[PDB]
Design a binder for this molecule. Structure first.
Ligand code: PLR
Ligand code: PLR
Ligand code: PLR
Ligand code: PLR
Lengths: 444, 444, 444, 444
């Protein structure tokens, strides 16, 4: 009796997801969730009882291990041409995809950009996703050859411009105290020296390693609005930061932001290889969508859908709150640990995720020591702790960087990065701090 | 006693996979396979006991459902810039990826291209994968604007040229009996009318729907070799066909093939969204690899690795043999079924996968009937049976096709497609034939 | 859409199960099966979304891996008063239990005992289930002290009588050709000698190792009926035999059979640990059930339900046909191998499952050759093959057997056992034959 | 590389388990756990790559879903002669069984009975396991006919004596304040009256529903020792109580305790159906084990092994601490709620798990108000909450109880039960309190 009435309780919660398309506040139980997924998957034609297929793409699976791990979703997302089209052979995977995007939109508002208009998950890394942005803009701006780009030493966002077949105009950053920041004069100087006509867009970055900080999106938004140049923001892991997101929201408010791009794995704790393209003008975001040729994996969407339904927005809020606390906590431990070493926490207030500590007391010249500290942390099972020494030469797609990983040619000292990224735990910091200590003692 | 000695038996079979990198002849038991995968996954730093992470990309997972369905592989494939580089934080996923590619190479030889030099799985559809080919060629051929392309009515392979920012030079096909084939005169005519300098490459297609057939790769290979123009073959679902593959092998032999591109889902019965880029010149295939910006999903590779280890090459040989038999069987049933309807099997011998049956006895003009047959098969749970009526106008990225889906502007009659793609079963044909019959009777 | 009409299809198969309680003719698809189970599990109170529990047995599960591997079925079957009883806290578990027993009833009819009245799965193996039968009979026959038992050398069925707290009266078998068959005169003599009121039951055995054969149930059914003594049949792995089953059907037809018991795993290829108790007196089978104190595991019931739902009655029949055929094959092959060694196949026509080959030409007196042969096969990973030398002495629970494993005190010769049990494949026979020959050559 | 040194880490934890047989202090990671299990399962002969089987019990599994959900453990535990015995065909199952019993021994020490000598998991629930105890005692005391049993109203433990084939001698409890406690004088009187040789055992009970409290085991242990009678303790859910456990430890210290039995699920949050039999005479516990006829399910053993390996001893202690605390909380909260309704918390200090609240102010004589209250809570999805009106009459196995569910013939008042059992959360208490108040307001 209370049996089929128990079902209704899960049902109410699924109806709510579909009819409003926002995250649940509290996460779903696994039971509700898997129920939901089986429901969807049986909607796909490959999962019809007594189907017959005489096509070349019938979603036949050879290995039951493969079918089951994908919850029997096989046909991917989109149609032949358009990636945002309801697949006629896959009603269930189409709806998976629709819901997923909707949930992600919901979170992006929740995270600080309450005026975001439209977004979609794309099964590529952030780099290739940025590239798809550029490939779309080419068709809108025939004359353009150049992408203006405030320097940031990440091989993927840089390569994305070159993979799209454009030329990066590398605007160095300005040292303001400890921070490396947008050189607004140099940016406007280039627009004029090259002409709005010849600029594909300005390519800015929020989330980054200190001592760089998030670009001055407000001012760039204004510049772009004025010269009628597209603005594309690399927000790889900025969704988890209130500062980064408000900055984007304020940019949209006073000027022009055409699209911002975020990594799924970095913001949602899922496997690498997916991303979100998002914007404020609905039709442009659709256009980037339609520029994608063919059907794409449904795997990244499924993960994010699974992850958000289990968390609910309250669970994501909790991860965000804890990242903020873990950031303060990591900073204070590094203030304490540095002072003890006559090093200091570099003063980088405009960067809310990443931190840097001086390594001035290390004789890199005589006995490579900054570098020896590098491999030492890796072996001692510390990861994500980046060491940046002086005088790093790296070549990438032909362009040579001087001072690579410091986002500038001559930063005053070598330092060490650490970050409070989402899902970090207090044990992470304490182990890091203890192991760091141990490592320092063995070098100086 | 025979306990730890039982382990050695699985071990021998894993050692064999690694030391030689070819498929097992007979498939592995699931036990060996999952053992193998757990082994690999524990090699990834995110799965180290007592790891600490202070980075922004630590492969943290929020949902255990997500971790487990990916066998705990989280970090994806490649490094920041280069997709073929051993990820230092993911030794296990790097090796997964290496082995996967190696296995796929092994199969491509087994399938008919015994001189293939190098290949790699890429987590994008075939369309975007073709696009990555073009984006790579741009940098090698600065002057090029045009891609010469023997017509084939598939929105994705066509869009791939435009997404890469080039212009498709659409070479119509020549009607030779029932077959639509490469117009070699028109192709060479364009090379000269435009100049080798201005051609990015020739973009040919093997696997396709009848009455088109695989392009004359031999002759095009010669043309491309002569005018020093790159040759890029769309082999979307050709791996499963001995004719298609030998054709590619013969092309490489007498001339120039730079890369050929295949869908994972269509050739290996896995979820959509992945592909294989392959070639004969090692360094070029590496170059396309390095053109990809950022880390990519490891999901498609895992599926193909899982699928091939379970099948072994003998299992794949068996699927291939059965596709050939199911093709004969499907043809004979359609000869019988057509003759009974005063229709006929179109004579399309050079096409080994797809078949077509005349629908001349259908009054599309008066009562849409060809089209009514279309939705009717869909509702009756038949899929992959394509109906192509006369006078189909479709626009795609600006270009309008006249006679769309017939690969020509004025094909002599409407017809119906059916194909023997891999993993098809005799029940598929018989259900198709029965349901087709039922559908015809209700229209004529 | 096509999507929602899809669920309809699976609901149809499920509805049909619930209504008629019969096995599907054709196996269910995994998707339908897992859908079905998820519906059931959400019906247990521990899986309710709003539930709060303040009891001692609330179905709380600590480990997700444990929860998930049992499809979230936690409460077991029954109530502490009866296992046949519906659990108020677990309507889904309760439903699973009823469905299972119903399907199993179906298959017992299918397999040859078309007049079975009642049965139930009990999560104890065949031995303890026989004990549960004797324990029930105790309260029905206060004076009874003895169980009359035609000898079969298997420790579980023998211990069952002692565990139940009764005294086995071992009745020797009578050599007839090569066969060991029931000594009917000796059985009726013991009845007469001890007096019927002192006999708890007669305990017969159908399935058994050659040269023994299924007891003459018809004659025993007659004796039992005439002397008004309970007849309990050990049918551990007789469900897979039309012969054994027909013999039980015949016994019920001509005389008296109170219960027969079968192993879940031996007859249905599920893990060890469950059984089925069946009978013709519905009231009496209910009494054996109600004699069980407390709740019981639902795991074995779940295993068989999954198995029968995936195989369908057609799948199970196929296994039974394949078993018959492998029996002829294994037999012919052993006829052939024995000749080459001047041994022969013992003629045991009345045993449909198990075969015996003479080992008369190995000198166990002079050199363990028989014994060696056993361990030799064991090391070549042949399992099930049983070697029986002359004059084995085994004491079980204080009772000594001469010629243990031969079911008789003095059997003509040493022999080797081999059987065709459900799921055996030709490879099994060929590998066994090849390895036995290699082993025979070694010892000689 | 770092990868191969990784496996080393998990092997270390595994080695430590095998060597010492103790619970890990900190829980295992799933990856280590699943690695471990896979190693074990490949050690069973049914999982051998080269195996051929020609037997009746070869571990063949028809369904992959069944195979996989049991981690490919198929053969069960033991041999048909003894369950403590190593299976030659299943070294991994055999190993799993030994490890499980060892961990469980560890936890029983941990939980308070530090002098336990021996135990084993048996895949029967607590009732049948008590039966297995009486069945063993039969052969040890041929004259014994009676089981002396201080009354506790729970049908499983009562039926266990009857199922075993003995006659319960029900000893009424003595009202002491609000509590029902053992009537020691009446117990010793029955011994004297019936004679020790006619008593199979005395059967006491620790865990139980308030107002009953754990039997005075110390006094009973003394009596039992003096009169040389076996003492069997029903400890169904007492492992989670330091009090109940200390009381068993004390009884063993001062007098005689032959075995005590506990439920797997009630004490370890695994599914229903398993139990643990433990004692201080190692030889005697071995006899209870060897009295089991045949192979048994390994599922319950697997559940607890997974559970204890994931929790670790630290995890289990945390659950026990949380249970104590929720008891105070639930108690204070019930003290508060009762006052508002002019009811009181019955004073039952000696019962550490279960609480009782008076329902003296509801007129069950006039209007089912007590009974209504029960069904009312049931519909608001409160489970475990038990309502006990005055003068309930229940006949179990032909024995009639007055005031059934109250453990006495005439208890002062109707009351409501609530318990803090392992895994209870504050939400449980708050939801129960809120809903009980809403239900109390309704009835009045
Ligand atoms: C499948 C296929 C493609 C690739 O399509 P995607 O959806 O991008 O994988 C291209 N051309 C043809 C003819 C195809 O069949
Ligand atoms: C992660 C990240 C990217 C994107 O890298 P992918 O590997 O392509 O996802 C780009 N720029 C920065 C600063 C990043 O942190
Ligand atoms: C749980 C319980 C039992 C055992 O019940 P089963 O259903 O057989 O596991 C026995 N006595 C008491 C007091 C119990 O609470
Ligand atoms: C299998 C078998 C049994 C039952 O053995 P269990 O291990 O208790 O399941 C009983 N008698 C015979 C002849 C058997 O083969």
């Amino acid at each position: 009796r209370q049996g089929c009435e128990a079902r209704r309780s899960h049902e109410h919660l699924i109806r709510l997801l579909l009819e409003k398309g926002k995250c649940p506040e509290n996460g779903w139980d696994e039971s509700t969730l898997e129920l939901f997924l089986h429901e969807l998957a049986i909607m796909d034609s490959n999962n019809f009882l007594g189907n017959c297929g005489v096509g070349e793409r019938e979603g036949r699976v050879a290995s039951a291990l493969v079918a089951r791990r994908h919850y029997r979703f096989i046909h991917g997302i989109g149609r032949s041409g358009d990636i945002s089209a309801v697949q006629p052979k896959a009603a269930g995977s189409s709806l998976l995809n629709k819901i997923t995007n909707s949930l992600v939109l919901d979170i992006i508002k929740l995270a600080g950009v309450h005026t975001v208009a439209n977004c979609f998950v794309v099964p590529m890394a952030t780099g290739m996703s940025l590239t798809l942005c550029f490939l779309t803009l080419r068709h809108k701006r025939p004359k353009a050859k150049y992408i203006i780009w405030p320097r940031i030493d990440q091989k993927s966002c840089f390569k994305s411009m070159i993979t799209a077949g454009f030329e990066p105009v590398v605007i160095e950053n300005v040292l303001e105290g400890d921070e490396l920041r947008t050189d607004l004069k140099a940016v406007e100087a280039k627009v004029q020296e090259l002409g709005p006509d010849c600029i594909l867009c300005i390519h800015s970055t929020t989330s980054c390693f200190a001592p760089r900080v998030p670009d001055r999106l407000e001012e760039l938004a204004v510049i772009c609005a004025n010269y009628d140049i597209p603005h594309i923001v690399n927000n790889a892991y900025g969704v988890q930061s209130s500062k980064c997101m408000h900055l984007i929201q304020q940019g949209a408010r006073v000027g022009r932001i055409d699209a911002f791009v975020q990594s799924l794995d970095k913001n949602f704790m899922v496997p690498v290889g997916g991303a979100i393209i998002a914007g404020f003008n609905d039709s442009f975001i659709q256009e980037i969508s339609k520029m994608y040729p063919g059907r794409a994996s449904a795997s990244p969407s499924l993960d994010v859908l699974i992850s958000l339904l289990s968390l609910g927005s309250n669970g994501y809020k909790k991860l965000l709150k804890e990242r903020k606390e873990m950031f303060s906590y990591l900073s204070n431990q590094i203030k304490k640990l540095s002072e003890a070493y006559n090093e200091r926490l570099l003063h980088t207030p405009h960067n809310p995720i990443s931190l840097a500590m001086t390594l001035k007391t290390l004789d890199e010249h005589r006995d490579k020591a900054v570098t020896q500290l590098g491999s030492m942390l890796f072996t001692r099972q510390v990861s994500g702790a980046r060491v940046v020494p002086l005088g790093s030469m790296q070549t990438v797609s032909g362009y040579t960087f001087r001072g690579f990983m410091s986002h500038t040619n001559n930063y005053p000292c070598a330092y060490l990065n650490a970050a409070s990224a989402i899902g970090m735990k207090m044990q992470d910091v304490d182990l890091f701090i203890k192991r760091l200590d141990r490592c320092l003692k063995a070098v100086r």
